[PDB]
């Protein structure tokens, strides 16, 4: 016969002991552990809600891959990718390039907790989390590898994070700050709670939905399967937060949550927002980026913060309003500077699309539509040279994304500058500047793309030079997804 899990589970996490040959501080260095004065005994109250043991893990995960890899092989010779909508293709290339190696890097963030967390249950769940991200990094290399012969852009699934292309810098800026350079406890909070529980867990659900809707069952099964691993390790932050609150560290906990949620939001505004409201075909749009955020993200955070005894971040109201604009600016920025990215941005501003946008965002045509009006006229009148840039946009020193906002009739573009020790920093928002001010030494001498350009690190010092500095060459450099097909609707 066999024992029930509940009868022996606790012994798997009864692993703390009192060091004698070394000190506790040597074994669990504060910069790596983040125990924050809270004792080993108190961290032992940590109790993960979603439990799993080794044998259950390998059995279950074995079946997940059997399924996902089986779907891939069965649909491979069908060549769906060769007849898929350009916007969908670009969606995947963007996805893989930004994510693949960051997923893998996350296995090291989990490993940070597996070694240094003082909570035994946290160390074992992080070992499974480490394995999950190992899987996510590998399977997300394996799937796009099938398309390397179709376009050099697919090579960026591996390459992107190894380059200085602006989007990749923004990605590393976020990921290195949230999970690679923080103590164990901070990681469980900022990565596991704020980013995975708060954003990606639901997003991957929507992504898999869109993939199915687009007729891409391979990618649909991929994302769908990866998503099921998320809850298992995204759970880690909750217990850590309760421990910090139960003791005297609620403000420290609140500050980590505030920072992580804002940084996650900014990355999201550029990697997901544009895709939902512009790349996905009008007929396949269930809801708008804003509707998705409210229904699936914002409500859940409020719910969660309440149950943990935390507050809504100070910027919550601004965050609410920004749902109308931010992504629209990131999309316009990405499309205008299209040759600076490794995928083809879809304009998404045809008459039909613009009326939809007006529905979902009253005032869009008077604001955002204005810029797109000039772009369109130029394309109609054979002046495409005016739809590509000749300079670099101002980059935020925190999120490393372009500083952009409401244009046209309700012009409201602002820069939250900051002079610190002789240097002038630029921020795309109040919260971004705040993230810097609460911990200046963490960001101080970092330089964004513009800072480097102005320092002389990009040579030759021009756009062609900036492009080589970012490892971008013809073939991967982006252009309009549907090859300006939508222009014909205007003559």
């Amino acid at each position: 016969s066999m024992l029930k899990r509940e009868d022996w589970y606790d012994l798997t996490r009864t692993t703390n002991w009192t060091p004698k040959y070394v000190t506790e501080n040597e074994l669990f260095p504060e910069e790596m552990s983040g125990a924050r004065g809270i004792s080993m005994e108190a961290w032992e109250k940590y109790d993960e809600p979603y439990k799993i043991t080794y044998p259950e893990y390998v059995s279950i995960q074995r079946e997940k891959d059997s399924g996902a890899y089986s779907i891939k092989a069965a649909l491979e010779r069908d060549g769906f990718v060769d007849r898929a909508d350009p916007g969908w293709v670009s969606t995947m290339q963007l996805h893989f390039g930004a994510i693949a190696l960051e997923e893998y890097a996350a296995s090291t963030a989990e490993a940070r907790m597996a070694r240094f967390a003082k909570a035994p249950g946290n160390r074992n769940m992080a070992t499974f989390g480490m394995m999950d991200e190992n899987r996510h990094g590998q399977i997300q290399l394996y799937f796009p590898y099938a398309n390397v012969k179709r376009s050099r852009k697919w090579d960026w699934a591996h390459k992107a994070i190894h380059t200085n292309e602006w989007a990749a810098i923004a990605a590393r800026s976020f990921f290195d700050d949230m999970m690679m350079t923080r103590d164990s406890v901070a990681v469980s909070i900022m990565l596991t709670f704020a980013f995975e529980t708060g954003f990606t867990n639901m997003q991957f659900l929507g992504l898999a939905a869109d993939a199915a809707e687009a007729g891409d069952h391979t990618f649909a099964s991929l994302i769908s399967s990866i998503q099921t691993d998320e809850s298992r390790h995204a759970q880690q932050g909750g217990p850590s937060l309760k421990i910090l609150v139960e003791n005297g560290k609620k403000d420290e906990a609140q500050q980590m949550v505030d920072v992580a949620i804002w940084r996650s939001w900014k990355l999201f505004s550029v990697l997901t927002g544009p895709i939902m409201d512009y790349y996905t075909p009008l007929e396949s749009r269930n809801q708008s980026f804003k509707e998705f955020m409210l229904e699936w993200i914002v409500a859940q955070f409020e719910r969660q913060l309440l149950d943990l005894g935390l507050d809504k971040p100070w910027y919550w109201d601004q965050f609410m309003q920004d749902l109308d604009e931010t992504h629209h600016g990131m999309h316009l920025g990405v499309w205008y500077w299209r040759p600076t990215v490794w995928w083809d941005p879809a304009a998404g501003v045809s008459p039909e699309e613009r009326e939809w946008l007006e529905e979902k965002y009253p005032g869009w045509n008077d604001t955002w539509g204005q810029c797109w009006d000039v772009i369109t006229d130029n394309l109609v009148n054979g002046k495409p040279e005016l739809t590509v840039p000749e300079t670099l946009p101002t980059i935020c020193n925190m999120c490393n994304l372009p500083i952009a906002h409401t244009p046209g009739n309700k012009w409201n573009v602002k820069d939250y500058q900051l002079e610190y020790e002789g240097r002038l920093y630029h921020f795309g928002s109040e919260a971004d500047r705040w993230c810097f001010q609460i911990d200046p030494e963490r960001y101080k001498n970092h330089t964004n793309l513009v800072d480097r350009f102005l320092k002389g690190e990009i040579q030759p010092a021009d756009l062609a030079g900036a492009l080589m500095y970012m490892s971008l060459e013809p073939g991967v450099m982006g252009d309009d997804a549907h090859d300006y097909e939508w222009v014909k609707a205007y003559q």
Binding site: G329, L332, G333, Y336, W368, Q370, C371, W372, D373, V374, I375, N378, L386, T387, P389, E390, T391, L392, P393, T394, P402, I403, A404, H405, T406, P407, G408, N409, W411, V413, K414, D415, Q417, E419, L424, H426, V450, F453, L454
Partner: protein, 83 residues
């Protein structure tokens, strides 16, 4: 060469716009308009382009030159349409 960040009225993004220390605010505005007017912002023949410090809103005289503006390198400037 002096770098400044151009926040052009009605545009959606702030851009890097290198200017010259001997340039006039009108000449600064001309260099900024290059990256915004007819790209994503419509011209306004009637109006006149003026330059004001973004941080505090200080309005600079059309004839003042960069060298006397007491700008910090990379300073953000608003280029607005006025009478």
């Amino acid at each position: 060469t002096f770098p400044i960040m151009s926040n052009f009225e009605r545009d959606f993004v702030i851009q890097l716009v290198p200017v010259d220390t001997e340039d006039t605010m009108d000449q600064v505005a001309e260099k900024c308009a290059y990256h915004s007017i007819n790209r994503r912002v419509h011209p306004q023949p009637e109006k006149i382009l003026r330059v004001r410090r973004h941080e505090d809103g200080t309005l600079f005289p059309r004839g003042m030159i960069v060298s006397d503006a007491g700008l910090r390198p990379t300073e953000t400037l608003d280029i607005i349409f006025m009478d």
